Design a binder for this molecule. Structure first.
Ligand SMILES: Cc1[nH]c(C(=O)NC2CCN(c3ncccc3[N+](=O)[O-])CC2)cc1Br
Ligand SMILES: [Mg+2]
Ligand SMILES: [Mg+2]
Length: 194
């Protein structure tokens, strides 16, 4: 209703109108860029000194799940928007705007908080769903086929090459890639340079 929500909605419209100006293209390259946008957040949180494990999973139907053991995206009610910080951050995310569905689970304050979105729009208010003794952020997203019209299927080797490189370039971070798309044949590569 307020000036805040208005700018968020205009922001989503702008990203979906010209996706290639935000992520380079809507080809297979652009699809893979979505993963790097999320993963780069976890890398920064590790470099800041608050995380050291990152897991990227290619799930059934080419959902992507990214999990870190950082502090967790904050959930406190923000001054600007009057909404949880996590909601504000994710409603301005290009990955969220270009995903048909996105989910977040924040582990923080010994609590698990959950919110879901479609094309960047929150589907309900941030909800406490359980408790935890760890901190971290889990992001699950499904790329929007309306945007990524060529393909929404990830290439394991493409993710693997860059994930390995990230681990090599950011020594000490454990980065794991797992492909669960075929439950009968699951592949996993784990990188941890010392
Ligand atoms: C997958 C993933 N991980 C993160 C992440 O770790 N974000 C950090 C950003 C800094 N955070 C903060 N922590 C404490 C106070 C204020 C903060 N902040 O400014 O967001 C913790 C989460 C964002 C996303 Br997608
Ligand atoms: Mg509570
Ligand atoms: Mg380590």
């Amino acid at each position: 209703y307020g000036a805040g929500q208005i700018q968020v909605l205009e922001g989503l419209e702008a990203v979906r109108k010209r996706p290639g100006m935000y992520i380079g293209s809507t080809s297979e390259r652009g699809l893979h860029h979505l993963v790097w946008e999320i993963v780069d957040n976890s890398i920064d949180e590790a470099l800041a000194g608050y995380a050291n494990q990152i897991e990227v999973v290619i799930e059934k139907d080419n959902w992507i799940k990214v999990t870190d053991n950082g502090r967790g995206i904050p959930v406190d009610i923000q001054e600007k928007m009057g909404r949880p910080a996590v909601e504000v951050i994710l409603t301005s995310s290009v990955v969220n705007a270009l995903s048909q569905d996105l989910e977040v689970y924040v582990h923080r304050n010994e609590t698990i908080y959950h919110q879901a979105y479609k094309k960047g729009v929150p589907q309900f208010d941030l909800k406490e769903v359980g408790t935890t003794d760890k901190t971290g952020t889990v992001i699950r997203f499904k790329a929007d086929g309306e945007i990524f019209t060529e393909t929404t299927v990830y290439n394991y080797e493409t993710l693997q090459q860059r994930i390995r490189e990230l681990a090599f370039l950011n020594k000490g971070i454990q980065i794991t890639l797992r492909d669960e798309r075929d439950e009968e044949n699951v592949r996993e590569d784990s990188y941890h340079y010392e």
